[PDB]
Design a protein around this ligand. Structure first.
Ligand code: 6C9
Ligand code: 6C9
Lengths: 193, 193
């Protein structure tokens, strides 16, 4: 039951490492999961819904990891605290590059994937502004830009920069340099007067 | 000749303000330009090539404006110099929102649009790193991150942030705040130790 479902999700993730969603048929997903086509439709309405679930799981795994961090402050300086938080997204999306890339391309065409991404980005930007506000309240960061607008651009930068790096786009920051790069932009823009 | 061509480009830009490229037919472009369908095919191989030309013109207009600025230093402080440079992209792409949005969505599917965007982004990132390097050489900015990687993330941030603002995406920086927002990120990340 949940096993036939996981089989179908695991096949689509393995297949997405090789071709885009358009070059993958329901029969490919069925065959790979060891089931027939009509049995597939019992678990998912379409291959698009398969992607939606995969992205849902990846986005929830990132969100849960960040919530864990939030309730368990790392005992370290400010720069390292932002690094560990950004690293949650670098490791989680960077461990699922194929879903990340397919999820990103599906935003243009799927309302559900567009709204999932948007809900979570709003949540992650609100958390980022809450932390900047705490930092200003404590006297550790200066009152420069509106925190929420600062948070928005910094989260958009990470979405675009992480994802260009993972896809190996031309241009992009190499993946072994993107964490340092982004932490520097964050710390100087949050703390710089 | 060049007039029938401009008519077709002007119709596609006006139509793209209302629906996406998929909801626009060659007959719509022809009718709007006052020509037949076979006459259309004489000037463009497809409606996709129409978009490619429109984006080409917008990208070249931005690049030319920036080159003008480069050969005509504005007599002002560092923050205002970055502001005027980013403003070239805010005004040029912000005066062509429909083409910008359609050009962006076409990157997923059109190799030509993907390579146009990439060539120009490489050029704009190289210029940005050349300027950061000049700034460090003169003793005005500290030697922090590799300039070219810094330039890459800052240009990716602007592409994503400008474009979310222009499309009114949820989340996005409001369009009357995005220039200030980005200049602050740039100046603190370039000059901050
Ligand atoms: O790096 C990111 N954000 C890291 C921020 C730092 C702490 O919470 C969010 N993101 C947000 C969407 C894709 C990548
Ligand atoms: O804001 C941008 N760049 C501004 C930089 C500042 C000076 O030259 C480039 N971009 C680059 C692509 C889309 C928007």
């Amino acid at each position: 039951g949940d096993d036939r479902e996981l089989a179908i999700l695991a096949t689509a993730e393995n297949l997405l490492e090789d071709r885009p969603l358009a070059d993958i048929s329901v029969d490919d997903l069925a065959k790979g999961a060891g089931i027939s086509r009509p049995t597939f439709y019992f678990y998912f309405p379409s291959k698009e819904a398969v992607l939606l679930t995969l992205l849902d799981r990846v986005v929830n795994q990132a969100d849960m990891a960040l919530q864990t961090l939030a309730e368990n402050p790392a005992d370290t300086d400010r720069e390292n605290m932002w690094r560990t938080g950004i690293n949650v997204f670098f490791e989680t999306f960077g461990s699922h590059k194929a879903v990340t890339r397919a999820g990103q391309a599906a935003r243009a065409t799927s309302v559900e994937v567009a709204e999932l991404w948007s809900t979570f980005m709003q949540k992650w930007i609100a958390y980022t502004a809450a932390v900047i506000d705490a930092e200003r309240d404590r006297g550790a960061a200066p009152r420069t830009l509106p925190a929420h607008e600062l948070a928005t651009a910094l989260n958009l930068m990470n979405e675009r920069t992480l994802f260009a790096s993972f896809a190996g786009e031309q241009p992009s920051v190499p993946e072994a340099r993107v964490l340092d790069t982004l932490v520097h932009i964050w710390v100087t823009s949050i703390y710089g007067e």
